[PDB]
């Protein structure tokens, strides 16, 4: 209860009881088991009372990947578990670990949840199923022989249940122009807002940029304080956009309007009254 | 030694915060200020301030100033909870984290709605950032109740410290959450909201923190597409190429255990962030004494495998530098054309994957690239001497990686490797087995189930079935 615990109350009570009886308190083990290493494997072995088979595991260099695929022959021959029921105890512990484990590194289609919906005791088969390159879109074609030879499901009832359950499955819009280090933050927020509100965007991640300007349905120009006084990149893109004349909207932020580019109207930016200026700009373009 | 003078508590915590009977708004407002300032001159002093800070925190925990504070953050007439939270900041180490996680997630997450005053937002954001480092249960309560939303709303802000706290909080939550936590974070579209933080110009720490957060989110291959649609993964490589870990480096064994999986991933951005951070931490730890925690944590073999098969200059650069700073050999990148290898190449490849003990046997049997790519378990067991049943599994894992990385240009005439990779990136390993048996694109539509097992050597039945059912589509 202190190792696989997920609640503090329970962890605190177990730890207090262990300290009061005068015994060492095992540390909680990481849920991400496929990414384990030799140290984690050794600690897990020491925590479950299999300290005798620790030097064998260290010498054979068993990590998480090898641990989650460990067979009866390997246990009997390579690690030294001669006894027939000691291996049953070990596989009980391994089944508990597999049920507790965290398959996010390797699992792509969330197959562990699918197995758990069938039965909370089916969640141990996730690593076996995904090491064979299976997922939700491929389960409706797996066979009885494959689930035994490849995935490692031994019990016939579990194979039949999983099989029968598997068979039932059956252009950028706006372009942003800005002066670096002055209005980059405004451009970032503007792109984020317009992307959140369903409009595609192409931001300069830093002549094909001019082609992107052509491809963009609309254009966005930010009026940063002291931006146009330098003039250029902004000049070339603004003249290119004017060549088509497609919804040029300047957003005023401390711009006093110091060619024929200034004959346009825009919206002042409000730092705190957000989602209102964006709402207006949605209607504007 | 010296810190014992302050450990004797010469201030008595200013008569235990003026006996707790201040009773006045200005009284408590004053009283918090000097105990605050005292904790900063305790913290900011050379080489023993770090140790005495824990002593001050323990003293406060024992005196009950923590629960004092948690009842102080409610007073409505006391508009200045700012000093209260800004003192809770410095006193929050894991020992206090347990106590506050016990009871104060009501008061903290009720304060989290107070987003208007920036001077208090800068502190509550740090509180949430420190809380997220706790267990998965704490992370799930915070996410479910609204801490994640409070962090997300503060990405529109401008204060450098507040943005730093938000980025570090998101990174902490991503690192210490579970599958459900990461799924909800991507569901709230946190990947898109890291763009204004990673694409910054004023400072660089915010950029690094946002990139680390998105890189951690990019190693969960359930949400890789959702993360990539945000465009935030495009900022990682230029930033890492631009920055320098030699002096920018100014963590624990548990913390680096959450950095190693970034190294051991197929994502280039995640690998680059992992190498950058590992190089910085290696520099700091080698400068500040010596420690062999890297060998036990397994980052050495990861760095070796991120350079031997490296195909990116930046990744190689960060790796080589980290390996040199740790004082170890830097393995040479191996040639891609494996079928044209010779005994020398085979020996080097064996030495670079930790199988140096089974090197004399390989030399004696004169195994070249062609023999290496067609190696069976009976041959491994009988001739080369790998008796152990899982040593062979490790060797075949390494050989699978090599076969996936190899370059079959002299052998593959119809480009069967690309056809296999289109089906599945893990199917590319079968290219040599398929082409050495006299097969190509125009002949796959006549192959049989038994042929793909006995001749080509495809052992898994699922792979054979997939290859057959996709080859029949060729017509």
Curated annotation (Swiss-Prot), chain B:
Keywords: Cell projection, Cytoplasm, Differentiation, Hydrolase, Immunity, Innate immunity, Mitochondrion, NAD, Neurogenesis, Phosphoprotein, Repeat, Synapse, Transit peptide. GO terms for biological process: cell differentiation; innate immune response; modification of postsynaptic structure; NAD catabolic process; negative regulation of MyD88-independent toll-like receptor signaling pathway; nervous system development; nervous system process; protein localization to mitochondrion. It comes from the Eukaryota. Changing residue 361 to A: Does not affect phosphorylation level. Its EC number is 3.2.2.6, 3.2.2.-. The keyword Cytoplasm applies. Changing residue 448 to A: Does not affect phosphorylation level. It is found in: Cytoplasm; Cell projection, Axon; Cell projection, Dendrite; Synapse. GO terms for cellular component: axon; cell surface; cytoplasm; cytosol; dendrite; extrinsic component of synaptic membrane; glutamatergic synapse; microtubule. Predominantly expressed in brain, kidney and liver. Expressed at lower level in placenta. Changing residue 133 to E: In RRK to E mutant: Strongly reduced NAD(+)-binding to ARM repeats, leading to enhanced NAD(+) hydrolase activity and constitutive axonal degeneration in absence of injury. Changing residue 356 to A: Does not affect phosphorylation level. It catalyses: NAD(+) + H2O = ADP-D-ribose + nicotinamide + H(+); NAD(+) = cyclic ADP-beta-D-ribose + nicotinamide + H(+); NADP(+) + H2O = ADP-D-ribose 2'-phosphate + nicotinamide + H(+). Induction: Up-regulated by lipopolysaccharides (LPS). The keyword Ubl conjugation does not apply. Changing residue 50 to E: In RRK to E mutant: Strongly reduced NAD(+)-binding to ARM repeats, leading to enhanced NAD(+) hydrolase activity and constitutive axonal degeneration in absence of injury. Changing residue 90 to A: In WQH to A mutant: Increased NAD(+)-binding to ARM repeats, leading to decreased NAD(+) hydrolase activity. Homooctamer; forms an octameric ring via SAM domains. Interacts with TICAM1/TRIF and thereby interferes with TICAM1/TRIF function. Interacts with MAPK10/JNK3 and SDC2 (via cytoplasmic domain). This is NAD(+) hydrolase SARM1. It comes from Homo sapiens (Human). The gene is SARM1.
